[PDB]
Design a protein around this ligand. Structure first.
Ligand SMILES: Cc1cn([C@H]2C[C@H](O)[C@@H](COP(=O)(O)O)O2)c(=O)[nH]c1=O
Ligand SMILES: Cc1cn([C@H]2C[C@H](O)[C@@H](COP(=O)(O)O)O2)c(=O)[nH]c1=O
Ligand code: NA
Ligand code: NA
Ligand SMILES: [Zn+2]
Ligand SMILES: [Zn+2]
Lengths: 217, 217
């Protein structure tokens, strides 16, 4: 029982890995170990969608990319570079790294980032964006874990997309899909399904974020 | 028009101004000027509760206080000193000031804080908290305005609590009352009723936050 904070994370971006995407939106949801522990273990078929913990730290930010979003990404996320820039959104810069550091500094250590498909998308992309910056990465010292690999172990004890798992467990469609905060809240609910077994798995399988290879560059 | 960013603000605290309260929770919701203007003018009787603008910066944080919450405060907020401490929440410190500054810096200037009963509670309390800190105030250079004074001028052109105003306009009770994020989203919904007239009033009555006198000390 070492991981004191789980930070549920989701990124929106301009496109898929092959297009060399840039982050357009981020959401961080810091939840203390004890808040997940004291969430009710799901009963019934289907169980009701769990209530999020009262004590929560939330950060959600819109970020203007250097390159335009793909038509498909704009459609699902509701975001475009044009609209982000005309509403005065700033680039993924050093000030944002300072912002994230101060947010992470407020959380009891050790910390672990939780992201759906994080190992193939969210973590390597974030590593790439932070690599561009002159100031050292604020995610050095923090851990990370993929919730797909987490739920795959919890279920086995066909689609593993965020929506599919949410509808399987709760017989309800997720709200605000493909938005950073919406997907984080959807991720939280799925992780609140068996939160004690989830936390034990995180402890055993969480790896340092500094071990994550960048998506590109 | 000049206020490019409206930051909707709400604080939760240990009690009333007579008890010399300390902040237990804060929420900042940054909305660009155009995002408010491009909301549909609430049509219908009653009109539906509008969705928040897509492009939004949000920061919600729980803060451990130096003194215990009053019985009545813990009941409505659902927060307590012990629960904030046991979940590893940090005090209103210099790192929080850096966080606030980095968050505000991401917003196009000038900025204006919007809070319900802000002139008599939110702004003076936040001024007291920032006055304890060694680092310069992050809210220096930002403007502030009370949404009660805003609505009273727009409506007139009996209960003025956040819940009473929301119920009159939308015929529904607000959700997540007396929580920092819940009250900000409720405030944002009310301010989306007549956004163009709201922004016009903000540019007319926005005063520098540096002119706000501290609640105590
Ligand atoms: C699901 C999906 C995501 N993406 C990109 C855009 C999203 O901002 C980013 C993150 O995926 P997400 O919206 O499922 O969280 O991946 C696509 O380009 N096409 C797709 O079909
Ligand atoms: C409305 C109300 C607020 N308060 C204090 C505690 C809250 O954290 C703080 C902010 O009020 P709020 O919850 O309406 O936003 O003021 C009381 O102590 N008693 C009350 O009846
Ligand atoms: Na995602
Ligand atoms: Na209030
Ligand atoms: Zn997403
Ligand atoms: Zn409140």
């Amino acid at each position: 029982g070492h991981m004191q904070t789980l930070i549920f994370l989701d990124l929106e971006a301009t496109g898929l890995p092959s297009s060399r995407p840039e982050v357009t939106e981020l959401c961080l949801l810091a939840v203390h170990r004890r808040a997940l522990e004291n969430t009710s273990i799901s009963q019934g078929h289907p169980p009701p969608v769990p209530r999020p913990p009262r004590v929560v730290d939330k950060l959600s930010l819109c970020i203007a990319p250097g390159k335009a979003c793909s038509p498909g990404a704009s459609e699902i996320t509701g975001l475009s570079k044009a609209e982000l820039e005309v509403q005065g959104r700033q680039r993924f810069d050093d000030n944002l790294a300072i912002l994230l550091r101060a947010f992470l500094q407020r959380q009891p250590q050790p910390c672990c980032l939780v992201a759906h498909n994080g190992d193939r998308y969210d973590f390597p992309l974030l590593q790439t964006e932070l690599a561009r910056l002159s100031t050292p990465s604020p995610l050095d010292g923090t851990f990370c874990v993929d919730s797909i690999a987490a739920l795959k172990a919890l279920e086995q004890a066909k689609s593993y997309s965020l929506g599919s798992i949410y509808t399987r467990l709760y017989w309800q469609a997720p709200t605000d899909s493909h938005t950073a905060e919406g997907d984080v809240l959807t991720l939280l609910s799925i992780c609140q399904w068996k939160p004690q077994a989830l936390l034990q798995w995180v402890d055993e399988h969480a790896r340092p974020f500094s071990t994550v290879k960048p998506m590109y560059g």
